Write a protein that binds this ligand. Structure first.
Ligand SMILES: O=C(CNc1cc(F)cc(F)c1)N[C@@H](C(=O)NO)c1ccc(-c2cc(F)c(F)c(F)c2)cc1
Ligand SMILES: [Mg+2]
Ligand SMILES: [Mg+2]
Ligand SMILES: [Mg+2]
Ligand SMILES: [Mg+2]
Ligand SMILES: [Zn+2]
Length: 889
């Protein structure tokens, strides 16, 4: 397998100036004719002309309208088309080809493929070569002139990039459309869509040039009523880029298209963004609440690529985080402003510190700009995206809004229309940094280590207060564990947003302050500090690090109650929980290991429980925040702090802690569940798809979290509430009634009720599948067998497969059954899926990522299944490369 190295980047010996495509869709095949107007670059040294071309059936290839002859003038091996240099012209020439491809049987969903009755392309990263021959790398920019033809009845709507410049009828019930896109673009942003699409549309007038932009959102006819929120989100995205960044859309039209079969969430093809239907379509009657934030973030994300990815492009794939991390950061700024809820930022931190921290301490650990890759499909990772976003956000923390905006505009103005690298962005931020510090000697050279150094830094603290001197000191240390990428880890530039809370009145003691830690350790001293403060550290989660605050639980409770920063309050709660979890875990472990007939458990801190009650009973406190404080930290967060983690002992630990708190607060929980109903389930705007209230959605989250806690606790007659909840019009509510009914004899009655509510909407049925998959059922293995036989069957839809299996893999007690039956089951699903969709098979490997963190018996069970998958003769390149790296082989 070819390893590509970042240091090996070299420009092509060739240039592709113009692409002229004819894509003729027929019943059993698609014919692709392509003329490439090419040239010889200054880097050419007489080499063979090598095109990428994967799975193409050649009808003919030509140079300057002279048919080429196979074996003597070119070789094709189903991966590379090699034209021997003797037959390669030395000046401007035309290469042309006609190939046959087969979208109908393209179940890997890369290149050109059929999703239900829609023909659709997915070309990022290296999928364009599955459509026609190309030098398939993002530094080959070309103009595109694309004609698509098809049966008019099956495919009345034809779309590609650029302006539709012709529409014409063809004998035999066919028709064509020609799309010309003069501005240069890389081939991974090419797209084509053909189908019986229905749409909503609007006109957006840009803020400064007053250009009219036509906005279209498309789906299959059955789901056209689910398009309205997406259109509203697109308008919102457009306005936010104008308002925050001063950036306007440059083209006359923007199309968004939903398809049912998609490997990921969505794709930013220029003027033609293509979406997983679950990330574009929603209605209040047929979607859970999560869909609304999902559509907002995904529509926003693809729109923000128009600058950060499409107008400023990548030189090579090693710069992926420069468009993905930066666009996630732009998307997070947008979402935070649109939702105006503190849980938006908390939810991104929660994902980073569980999923991405796990990845960064796994054998898969890599920096946000890796040094090498084998599979580009495996290159797309939470490290590149989400740690990338936190690295791009730290620039804003360091610079402040005004100078961040100045540096960002320097980046856009200097690189608009050109490729760029991570260094280019750092240079633009450095210029703003010089301006801010009024110091042209200031620099961000150290900041570049965030792109090259893998692993999560640990930041720890000690404090000193001299009452007589009124002098306060914060001593800070940073440390990154050595790994396979660096034997010696260098200190990073770590910005530490800090407040100092007066413990007597809860007030701020200093102005906003960002400590710039640039050494392995430093001491930050504050004078005129009138009383000993409680420090509020890493406000907003200001760096992607393990925070060791070294505070007592009494101090953390005070921050939880009285601090001004939502993250520090939530993190103080998290830290209290974590101390309790580790202590009880060790006590349960010892009792198991020593076969104790009796033992003691350390109870949950009573003042902590009192503080939870105090916040829950505060009517001015935020419902979303409340839902976070009654939930223990995620299992994948906990696992970063325990070696040889016994999942059974952890399940017993969580059970004890939840029972402790519930035994004190269940009556509070129940009272709030009842009092929240009126506002949480208000139907005033149920038939207004444009009216989305994130606060109300957070109140439903709180109710459904409380209902879960009360159901698990078998709170007296709570089943009455569950049954009434099942009649709510909101799917978040009636799907909640299914999963919380798992603890009752009514489960299968609600199983059937919610199935009939769900089965006639493709996306709702998938949410139903997830709810069943996630259900806390002792018979979950028989239930999964039932889903397989009755609902899932042989579906190759990734949404179907992921819905049935991934939630179950988070069932701590049952997926990790000591027999290994859960590992066996998911390995069978991975191997089966790998026959037709390697990239989704690799997604289904996610539960194995922590394999070497578990107890030794479960490590061996997991390792056995991965070795079994690795031994399959037909294993894909994706799956082999991933499991080889994951198993340290
Ligand atoms: O949708 C999402 C959710 N984020 C995400 C985060 C991860 F860490 C991993 C992941 F998979 C997704 N991201 C978008 C995005 O960034 N849109 O702008 C995206 C992601 C991957 C491809 C792609 C790459 C290939 F090599 C392919 F072969 C292929 F079919 C698709 C296309 C678009
Ligand atoms: Mg083929
Ligand atoms: Mg405006
Ligand atoms: Mg289907
Ligand atoms: Mg290794
Ligand atoms: Zn993206």
């Amino acid at each position: 397998p070819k390893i590509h190295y970042r240091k090996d980047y070299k420009p092509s010996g060739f240039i592709i100036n113009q692409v002229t495509l004819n894509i003729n869709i027929h019943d059993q095949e698609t014919i692709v004719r392509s003329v490439l107007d090419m040239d010889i670059s200054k880097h050419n040294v007489g080499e063979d002309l090598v095109f990428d071309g994967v799975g193409l059936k050649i009808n003919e290839i030509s140079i300057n309208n002279k048919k080429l002859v196979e074996g003597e003038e070119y070789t094709y091996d189903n991966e590379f088309l090699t034209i021997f240099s003797k037959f390669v012209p030395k000046s401007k020439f035309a290469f042309s080809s006609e190939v046959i491809i087969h979208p109908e049987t393209n179940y890997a969903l890369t290149g050109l493929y059929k999703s239900k009755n829609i023909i659709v392309s997915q070309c990022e990263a290296t999928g364009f070569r599955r459509i026609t021959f190309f030098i398939d790398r993002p530094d080959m920019m070309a103009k595109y002139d694309v004609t698509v033809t098809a049966d008019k009845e099956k495919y009345p709507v034809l779309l590609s990039n650029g302006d539709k410049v012709n529409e014409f009828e063809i004998p035999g019930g066919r028709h064509g459309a020609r799309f010309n896109d003069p501005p240069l673009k890389p081939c991974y942003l090419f797209a084509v869509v053909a189908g019986d699409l229905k749409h909503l549309s609007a006109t957006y007038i840009t803020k400064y040039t007053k250009k009219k932009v036509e906005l279209y959102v498309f789906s299959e006819e059955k789901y056209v009523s689910k398009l309205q929120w997406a259109l509203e989100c697109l308008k919102k995205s457009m306005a936010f880029d104008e308002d925050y960044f001063g950036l306007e859309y440059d083209l006359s039209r923007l199309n968004l298209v939903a398809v049912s079969d998609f490997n990921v969430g969505a794709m930013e093809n220029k003027g033609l963004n293509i979406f997983n239907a679950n990330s574009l379509l929603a209605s209040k009657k047929n979607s859970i609440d999560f869909s609304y934030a999902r559509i907002l973030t995904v529509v926003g994300h693809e729109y923000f690529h128009q600058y950060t990815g499409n107008r400023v492009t990548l030189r090579d794939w090693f710069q992926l985080t420069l468009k993905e991390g930066l666009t996630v950061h732009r998307e997070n700024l947008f979402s935070e402003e649109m939702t105006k809820t503190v849980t938006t930022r908390l939810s991104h931190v929660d994902l980073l510190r569980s999923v991405q921290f796990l990845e960064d301490s796994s054998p898969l650990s890599h920096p946000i700009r890796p040094e090498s890759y084998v599979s580009m499909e495996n290159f797309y990772t939470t490290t590149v995206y989400d740690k990338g976003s936190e690295v791009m956000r730290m620039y804003l923390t360091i610079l402040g809004e005004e100078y961040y905006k100045k540096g960002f505009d320097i980046y856009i103005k200097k690189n608009d229309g050109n490729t760029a690298t991570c260094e280019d962005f750092n240079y633009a931020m450095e210029q703003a940094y010089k301006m801010k510090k009024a110091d042209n000697s200031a620099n961000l050279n150290q900041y570049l280590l965030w792109f090259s150094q893998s692993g999560t830094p640990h930041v720890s603290f000690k404090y000193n207060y001299d009452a007589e001197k009124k002098q306060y000191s914060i001593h800070v240390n940073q440390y990154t564990k050595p790994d396979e990428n660096q034997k010696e880890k260098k200190p990073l530039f770590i910005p530490i947003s800090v407040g100092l809370i007066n413990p007597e009145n809860g007030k701020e003691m200093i102005s906003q302050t960002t400590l710039e830690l640039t050494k392995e350790s430093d001491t930050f001293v504050f004078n005129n500090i009138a009383v000993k403060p409680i420090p509020s550290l890493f406000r907003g989660f200001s760096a992607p690090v393990y925070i060791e605050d070294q505070l007592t639980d009494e101090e953390r409770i005070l921050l939880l109650k009285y601090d001004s920063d939502a993250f520090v309050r939530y993190n103080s709660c998290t830290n209290i929980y974590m101390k309790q979890i580790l202590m009880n875990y060790n006590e349960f472990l010892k009792a198991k290991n020593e076969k104790l007939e009796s033992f003691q458990l350390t109870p949950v801190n009573a003042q902590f429980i009192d503080a939870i009650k105090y916040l829950l009973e505060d009517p001015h406190a935020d419902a979303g925040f409340k839902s976070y404080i009654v939930s223990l930290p995620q299992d994948r967060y906990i696992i970063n702090f325990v070696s040889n983690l016994d999942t059974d002992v952890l399940a017993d630990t969580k059970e004890y802690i939840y029972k402790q708190i519930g035994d004190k607060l269940n009556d509070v929980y129940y009272k709030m569940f009842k009092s929240l109903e009126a506002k949480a389930d208000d139907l005033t705007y149920f038939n207004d798809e444009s009216h989305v209230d994130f606060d109300q959605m957070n109140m439903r989250t709180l109710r459904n979290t409380l209902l879960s806690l009360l159901s698990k606790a078998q709170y007296p007659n709570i089943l009455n509430e569950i049954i009434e909840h099942s009649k709510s019009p909101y799917p978040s509510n009636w799907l909640t009634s299914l999963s919380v009914s798992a603890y009752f004899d009514k489960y299968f009655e609600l199983y059937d009720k919610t199935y009939k509510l769900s089965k006639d909407d493709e996306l709702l049925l998938q949410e139903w599948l997830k709810t069943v998959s996630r259900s806390d059922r002792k018979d979950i293995y028989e239930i999964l067998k039932k889903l397989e036989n009755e609902v899932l069957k042989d579906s190759k839809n990734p949404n179907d497969i992921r819905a049935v299996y991934l939630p179950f893999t988070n069932n701590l007690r049952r997926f990790h059954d000591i027999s290994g039956k859960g590992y066996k089951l998911i390995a069978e699903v991975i191997t089966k899926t790998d026959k037709f969709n390697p990239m989704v098979a690799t997604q289904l490997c996610e539960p194995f990522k922590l394999w070497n963190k578990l107890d030794t018996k479960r490590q061996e069970l997991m390792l056995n299944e991965m070795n079994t998958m690795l031994q399959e003769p037909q294993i894909s390149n994706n799956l082999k490369e991933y499991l080889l790296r994951l198993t340290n082989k």
